[PDB]
Amino acid sequence: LPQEMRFVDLKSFGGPDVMVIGKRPLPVAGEGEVLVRAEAIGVNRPDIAQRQGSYPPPKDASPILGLELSGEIVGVGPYAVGDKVCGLANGGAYAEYCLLPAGQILPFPKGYDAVKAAALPETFFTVWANLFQMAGLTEGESVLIHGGTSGIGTTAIQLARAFGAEVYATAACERLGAKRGINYRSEDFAAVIKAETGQGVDIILDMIGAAYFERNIASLAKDGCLSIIAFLGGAVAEKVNLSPIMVKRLTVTGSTMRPRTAEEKRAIRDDLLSEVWPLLEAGTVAPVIHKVFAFEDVADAHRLLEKVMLTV
Amino acid sequence: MSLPQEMRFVDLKSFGGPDVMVIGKRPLPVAGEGEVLVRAEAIGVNRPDIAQRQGSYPPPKDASPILGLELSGEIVGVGPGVSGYAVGDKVCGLANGGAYAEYCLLPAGQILPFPKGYDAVKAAALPETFFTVWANLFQMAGLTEGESVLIHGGTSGIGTTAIQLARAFGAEVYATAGSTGKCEACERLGAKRGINYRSEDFAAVIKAETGQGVDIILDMIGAAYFERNIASLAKDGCLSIIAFLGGAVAEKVNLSPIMVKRLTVTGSTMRPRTAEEKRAIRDDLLSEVWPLLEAGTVAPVIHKVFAFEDVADAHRLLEEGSHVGKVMLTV
């Protein structure tokens, strides 16, 4: 193992340019952690937010940009060295080596690239936890996904399709499994949903938030769930009628990934390996990569994101 | 020896204040399949009766358009094929409209017997508030022992009912109300603490008392309390919206804490529920709640009883807001 490793560091808060390839020691690896030498690293929306200083990283985790990687175990703590694995990192993934808690590690699925496997954790944990665990998606139910050409979007669509749901999306999408790709700009998605479904859709996975709040609420069937996952359309909704929530017993909820517990993340790792790994291995479901950048070019990658990946 | 030709019932000159309600005459209803017919001894007065009377809120299509949601009295007609009830039984129930009348239909899965010891008034005081509190606080929100709950309208029929069942089921309980007497009545009913909303900020009080927030809010206010409600919830907490006395349209919804704390915002409404849904509410109350009524651990809070012909005054009283508990009609 080297002395120092290259990591992505910031000159301040910016600004793609605020980022620069710095240098410092290698993480240790304590109780139920593993050390991984990175071959590939995911780039995700929360990373921009941090490079901006806009969002804090949680205080019990690495302050280095992070979340997702794949590569080779190169150390264990109190799985085996040379094992190839990908996982959800509590931050610090934007480095040549990065820890992982044993509850958050997964094997490369058979036949995957480094890049493909590192494209999995952030997006699959998120969809799995919100759309399957919390929302209890099952066969025959109907789902509407905003942000369909997103990393999360494309993952939600494929997995919703694969489990026998009827699928609609806002944003390619039909190719992935949507019954119907819905152009937001020109069609009214509430109107479309009313036309296509009986009395609305059972589940909405929402990355948009405020701007679509009133339309999401109107699109849901009796006993439907709105699961809010991000706030690309703002967090604050103006002059909004609560009443359909009561009238139709809607449930409105949401969750974020980073603050989720050690046990909660491990539970999600388990379902993924049990329920989804088989589909990835059969080629039923695959991640979708827009482009791959060299690790040095991290600035370019961010710039593009306004699934994009980094080669070490 | 048969049944009267015609019936007294409450009717509307038109939509407006208490004073547009007059006592007219119409034919008695006849119990068809899976219905029983009751001769009314006592009728419950409820808020949706005011709004239906003012025209704010129409009754569902498939209900009687006559006012009134609950009642007690005697069975007088058993409709075709109805198992387990007999002309002559003393019973209370939730009515799909109609209860402001000498005779009223009750669907079968919505009948309950008098709890032991109960006169007719106390029996008629149960259905609306009890079905409502059971469905939203227990069935949907799943209140169990150790959890904290905040209840708005501590002093209304549903507030009074809510406080009791919650205390009896081992919750830590908080409640809001509009005066000190009212806050003190809440504590008598089992609120650890009555927040007086006029001169206290119930969100600050909940912060001070719980540190993290409550697990359940049962909310009759809606819009005006939405932001503070959402702020007073703990992680994994559940806001349950049961009426919109503070309006249905909130100016800002900061959606952010819903996502960050994993909150659930939900709601429901009694009248439009199916016959099976109401049935399940009914059985649950008969299993879980009757015994407690039996034992005197929990009882309706009856504020005043009016003679049937004085509905308009019972409505008056309610509009004033001077009450703790239900306002009731005797026939």
Alpha carbons A269 and A118: distance in angstroms, whole number: 14
Q: How far apart are CA B253 and CA A241, in angstroms?
A: 10
> Which residues are CB-contacts of A108 (< 8 A; sequence separation ≥ 6)?
A70, A84, A85, A86, A114, A117
Q: Which amino acid is at A58?
A: P
Amino acid symbol at A310? L
Contacts of B139 (CB under 8 A, 6+ apart): B280, B281, B284
C-alpha A132/C-alpha A242 separation (Å) is 26
Closest CA of chain A from B77, distance in Å: 34
DSSP character string of A181-237: EE-TTTS-HHHHHHHHSSSSEEEEEESS-GGGHHHHHHHEEEEEEEEE---TT-SEE
Instruction: Report d(CA B327, CA B156) in Å as an integer.
Output: 10
- Report how far residue B118's alpha carbon sits from residue B296's, in angstroms, rounded to the nearest whole number: 10
Residues B293/B267, Cβ–Cβ less than 8 Å: no
Instruction: Tell me how close the Cα of B13 comes to any Cα of chain A, in angstroms.
Output: 29
Domain B126-268 has CATH 3.40.50.150: no
Cβ contact (<8 Å) for A242 and B252? no
Query: Letter for the amino acid at B79?
Result: G
CA angle A269–A275–A278, rounded 5-degree value: 110
Q: Running DSSP on this structure, what letter comes out for residue A138?
A: -
Question: CB A242 to CB B259 under 8 A?
Answer: no
Q: Where are the domains of chain B?
A: 2-125+269-331, 126-268
User: What gap in Å lies between CA B156 and CA B197, rounded to an integer?
Assistant: 14
Closest by CA to B97, choosing from B53, B131, B67, is B67
* Distance (Å, whole) CA A41 – CA A94: 7
Q: For the CA atoms of chain A, what is the radius of gyration?
A: 20
Q: How far is CA B89 from the centre of its chain?
A: 24
Select from B72, B96, B207 the least CA-distant residue to B150: B207
* Nearest residue of chain B to residue A208 (CA atoms): B255
CATH classification code of A120-255: 3.40.50.720
Instruction: Say whether A120 sits in a helix, a strand or coil.
Output: coil
Backbone region of residue A91 per phi and psi (left: phi > 0; alpha: psi in -120 to 50; beta: other values): left
Phi, psi angle pair for B57, to nearest 5°:
-130, 120
Which residues have C-beta within 8 Å of that of residue B174, sequence separation ≥ 6?
B148, B149, B150, B151, B191, B192, B193, B194, B195, B202, B205, B206, B209, B214
Q: Round to whole Å and give the CA distance between A281 and B151.
A: 51
Distances in Å between the alpha carbon of B211 and those of A76, B220, B239? 39, 24, 18
Q: Which two structure tokens, joined as six digits, stand for A290? A: 């827009």
Contact B167, B147 (CB under 8 A): no
Interface contact A240-B222, CB threshold 8 A = no
- How is domain A1-119+256-312 classified at the architecture level of CATH? Alpha-Beta Complex (3.90)
Residue B224's CB is within 10 A of a number of other CB atoms, namely 15
With CA atoms as reference, the chain B residue closest to A209 would be: B255
Place of tokens 């937010």: A49
Cα dihedral A223, B134, B264, A221 in deg (nearest 10): 10
| CATH of B2-125+269-331 given 3.90.180.10, 3.40.50.2300, 3.30.420.40, 3.65.10.10 | 3.90.180.10
DSSP A18: G
Q: Measured between beta carbons, which residues in chain B are less than 8 angstroms from residue A235? A: 254-256
Q: Which chain A positions have a beta carbon within 8 Å of B259's beta carbon?
A: 228-229, 231, 254-256
* Token pair for B154: 């501590």
**DSSP letter string over B34-61?**
TEEEEEEEEEEE-HHHHHHHTTSSPPPT
Contact B151, B159 (CB under 8 A): yes
How far apart (Å, rounded) are the C-alpha atoms in residues A168 and A193? 8
* Chain-chain contact of B255 with A209 (C-beta, under 8 angstroms): yes
What is the rounded CA–CA span in Å between residue B236 and residue B64?
40
- What resolution (Å)? 2.5
Task: Give dist(CA A182, CA A203) in Å, integer.
Answer: 16
- The DSSP secondary-structure symbol of B142 reads -
Q: Tokens in use for B14? A: 């038109």
Contact in structure between B40 and B99 (CB atoms under 8 Å): yes
